[PDB]
Design a protein around this nucleic acid. Sequence first.
RNA 1: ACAGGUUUGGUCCUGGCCUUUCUAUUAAUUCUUAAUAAAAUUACACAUGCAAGUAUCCGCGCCCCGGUGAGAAUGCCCU
RNA 2: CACGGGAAACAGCAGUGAUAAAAAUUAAGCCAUGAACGAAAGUUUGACUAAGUUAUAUUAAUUAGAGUUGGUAAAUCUCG
Lengths: 117, 49, 77, 169, 86, 190, 292, 55
Amino acid sequence: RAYRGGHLTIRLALGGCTNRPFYRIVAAHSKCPRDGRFVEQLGSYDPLPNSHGEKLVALNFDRIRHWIGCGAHLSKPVEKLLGLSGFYPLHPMMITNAERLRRKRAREVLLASQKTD
Amino acid sequence: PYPPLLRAMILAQRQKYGDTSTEEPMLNLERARIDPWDYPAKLEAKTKT
Amino acid sequence: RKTRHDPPAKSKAGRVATPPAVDPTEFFVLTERYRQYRQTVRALRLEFMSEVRKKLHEARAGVQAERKAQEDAAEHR
Amino acid sequence: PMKGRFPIRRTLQYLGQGDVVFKDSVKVMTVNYNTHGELGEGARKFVFFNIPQIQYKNPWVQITMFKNMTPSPFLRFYLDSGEQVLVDVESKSNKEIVEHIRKILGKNEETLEKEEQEKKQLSHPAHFGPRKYCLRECMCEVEGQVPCPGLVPLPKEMTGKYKAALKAT
Amino acid sequence: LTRGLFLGLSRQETHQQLADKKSLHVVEFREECGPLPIVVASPQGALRKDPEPEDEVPDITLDWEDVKAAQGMKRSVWSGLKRAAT
Amino acid sequence: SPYKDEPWKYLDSEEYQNRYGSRPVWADYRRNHKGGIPPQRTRKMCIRGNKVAGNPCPICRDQKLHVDFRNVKLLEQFVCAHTGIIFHAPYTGVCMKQHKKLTQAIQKARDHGLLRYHIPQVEPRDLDFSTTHGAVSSTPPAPTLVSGDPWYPWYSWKQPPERELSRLRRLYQGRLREESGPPPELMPEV
Amino acid sequence: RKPTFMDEEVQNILIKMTGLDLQKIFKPALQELKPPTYKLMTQAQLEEATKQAVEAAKVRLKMPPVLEERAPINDVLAEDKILEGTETAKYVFTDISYSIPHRERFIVVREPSGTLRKASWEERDRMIQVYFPREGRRILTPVIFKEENLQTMYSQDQHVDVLNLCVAQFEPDSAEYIKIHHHTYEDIDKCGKYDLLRSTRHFGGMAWYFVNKKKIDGLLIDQIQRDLVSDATSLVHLYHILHPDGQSAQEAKKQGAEGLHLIKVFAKTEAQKGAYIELTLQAYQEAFITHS
Amino acid sequence: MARKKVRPRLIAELARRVRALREQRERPRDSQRYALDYETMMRPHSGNRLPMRAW
RNA sequence: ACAGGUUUGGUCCUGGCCUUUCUAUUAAUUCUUAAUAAAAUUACACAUGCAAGUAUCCGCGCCCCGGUGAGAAUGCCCU
RNA sequence: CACGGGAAACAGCAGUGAUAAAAAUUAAGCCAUGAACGAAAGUUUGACUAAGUUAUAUUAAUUAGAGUUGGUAAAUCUCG
Ligand SMILES: [Mg+2]
Ligand SMILES: [Mg+2]
Ligand SMILES: [Mg+2]
Ligand SMILES: [Mg+2]
Ligand SMILES: [Mg+2]
Ligand SMILES: [Mg+2]
Ligand SMILES: [Mg+2]
Ligand SMILES: [Mg+2]
Ligand SMILES: [Mg+2]
Ligand SMILES: [Mg+2]
Ligand SMILES: [Mg+2]
Ligand SMILES: [Mg+2]
Ligand SMILES: [Mg+2]
Ligand SMILES: [Mg+2]
Ligand SMILES: [Mg+2]
Ligand SMILES: [Mg+2]
Ligand SMILES: [Mg+2]
Ligand SMILES: [Mg+2]
Ligand SMILES: [Zn+2]
Ligand SMILES: [Zn+2]
């Protein structure tokens, strides 16, 4: 329907099943609902590991770069997914929470070593 | 340098069309200059051109 | 969700938000990582803009399109 | 269809098997014909048989009949650019009229499979959603992934209530 | 029903009689066998060299129930009912 | 059942030929129902515990019949010879549980090759078979890849200037949090 | 200039090798049947229908390509030790579009250690199947291609269906396709079941495997037993084409041998059991001279 | 869209007219708009409380 | 519709009604545990609690999500 | 329609009266997706996620009751 404003957004749409989520990579309007009407479905992302132990991601490269080139904004998880893809550089939130896991796990190692004594 | 997999498409596309030259493709940043946050935004209405 | 004409909550009327504590060195490296991150993403985005301009300009006025136009006109004649 | 002199021409197979598709600039197609004389027999058979097929394959193109005004039957094509194409029939039979129209102004065969080829690009197999537009609905239905919780129950360790119970204890 | 059924099945025309009355070969085109021309009957006697007149629009009597079944407009709930063994 | 691990022995037995003969098992069974049209769904399960309810199914009235992938002669009776599809449950007369078991058994037999079924001739997947493209062939490595350095200089950690730390301490005084040093290179495990 | 499978000489050799059996190539199949269509045809229309069925048979016996074993893909596009422990599983990124051919697609794996690398061939083909459905391929490796199930189908002489499942499931440059085809040709070589694959499009594959594996003995015995000897010396000429430096080829060039002399030279020279080929050819010669 | 049974609404245009007239007449001055109470840090005109980083 | 029951001392034809098949709400009787899907009497009136905030003040958002089918033959498709 | 007048508005999430044959918790979190804001750590979100209740519907078993027995239409003996 007709909205007062908003922008074009490439984001993750949550469909799927109870305790089995699924995100469809969706280029749509910002002001529409999460599972509402979209412009184009680009890709998919499987949040769960399979029998092969793989999390499976599909991206429609030419259409994604066309939408970004004509001005589609990206959300934080899809920039994270593109940073892991290597079409975009690594997202500094992945960088900083990685170093936060390094600091936390090193502090846990030190706490375990102190609790051993 | 490019992000690596985009750099892989650049190498693959030039190898597909036969460009033998192995020069590293470079992303140029003269239009990428970003004025930081405490610049005061223009409150005057921009004239459409 | 709420609406323009409804009153706000009485409990949250006297409530103001609290920003979290700041780790200064981590904040500074974080701020830099956004600066050259947004630099790289901006350069990539204007590169995709140039690609969109190239593809649209070719789809409008490509040499193949004038051959198609000349061929269909010649066949019609 | 029991009624009618030739009941087979009113079926969907006859309407869909007539292959004449005009160009996009074609707007008006006009048949002036006569109902007397052996000369207009081919034009009368053309009106009786093929104009439903051409009108089915070109729903937006106007097609108009006129009877007994001009002694010789003819067809007249009115285009977008004011262009008037006259096809004169006096002794040509129905199939010759069909190939004559399809050769003067129709759509080329290669243009037909390319038109259905960018028509078939719109339905990409990699999309997901409803059955009416997409092949799959769940990602669950794919053989290698996690089976769907409405058919195969999930293990306890993945379940959110067990996660909340272990976090609260 | 019994009298009409026996009259209809006694007025049945075989492929041998059709080939004898037309003096032409009759060919069965199976769909599971592809484009292979299975010949099931052959005209004994003199075989005619003149082909059949190919009419662009055949003149046959069509049934509206059969055409409606072919076009998929038969949405009756009793047509697709699963039933017992023969 | 004394047969158990071999279900085809009762199929080859003399008692099967004496009772059923060359006709299938479900040929002599007739389902009782409410009118001239049977319901689309049969009885769900016919034996509940030790109790056999009413007229049993053609499989279920003979307890020496075993629904398995090992016997092909039993499973062929529920598969059409010409059409090559599994017969539906109202066509035969078995219960829904044994019909699901039959469907799984025919699927496992076709996956194990014990039952013939139609395999269409399939064209090769791609038109041109080329490894020459850089998607499958190896690309030359990056200058940052051969040197062992991260892809960008800012992927690692850099010690910030002390005047910038003092400036951030001045701007966020009162709400400050304790600073941390460089991160470890490799984590140890618990 | 080594001989390849797509050369015109070897293609026409295999086309005249496989023969044409209309009833065998057009068999009533096990899908859902429909009532056949009848028409009245003249004799000339009957040979017209027969000949259009002949080119339909030729485009049905358009043979599958056979290739060598592909090289594994071991290329790492980026290494990141900073994401060594952030994730437990591995990520697969797949290029999807309608206009890119499937060999040119980018199938890229992030390992849990943080390496951006190229995927291997098996997971690459698995991704191609998952994000591009087609009939005949299972995503996981089927149980049917285990050796016990292969021996079950081969004792039930289902070799044409096994090869059809192999070409439908796997890719011709893969290792599993090669080993399944080779084990099939070995077992039909041991059992002498060459008559099953005569009018099948997979005849050229086992002929090519035999001419590279230097086992022409049993196949030549089978062809002389089925009394088709012009195609047998066509097979010998195929052997001489694929082995230009062979002592049979030099003896053939020295003697200027015809077809039957060519078969005799091959049997006396390079056949492992040439006595069987010689006695079978002698029996064929005396039988054909007595009956003609 | 356009139909043959559309009726000429006037009150919506009149209300937009009166609303524009009233905002142009009673447009708030910057002094009463931006005057501040320095203990509560709460705006008497807009009802907004100041953030603590600007306190 | 693969049809069946039903007019008459009885037969044939025409012609209605009902049964056999599937789904959804309510009621009655009965009822053991899980998983999944769905929660639906009301455009009648509402006690109470929450559902629009963020941000170095300006600003930006504030039926955007979500809810309902009252009204209108409204409207579907296309420039 | 909403300038104005009746008049103090849940056709938001929960719940309460009236009414109807018609009966979900006056509940936990933004941990994940979307939205809003901010340069940003981040904040909010009765959307949502995870649950609670209900044979309303499918599946698995832990479970045995309901309908019917003149014909259509499977199936009855003795009493009143
Ligand atoms: Mg849901
Ligand atoms: Mg409201
Ligand atoms: Mg009646
Ligand atoms: Mg009467
Ligand atoms: Mg009576
Ligand atoms: Mg109820
Ligand atoms: Mg504000
Ligand atoms: Mg709505
Ligand atoms: Mg009205
Ligand atoms: Mg409510
Ligand atoms: Mg109430
Ligand atoms: Mg209810
Ligand atoms: Mg209640
Ligand atoms: Mg109640
Ligand atoms: Mg709460
Ligand atoms: Mg949140
Ligand atoms: Mg958050
Ligand atoms: Mg139920
Ligand atoms: Zn699912
Ligand atoms: Zn049973």
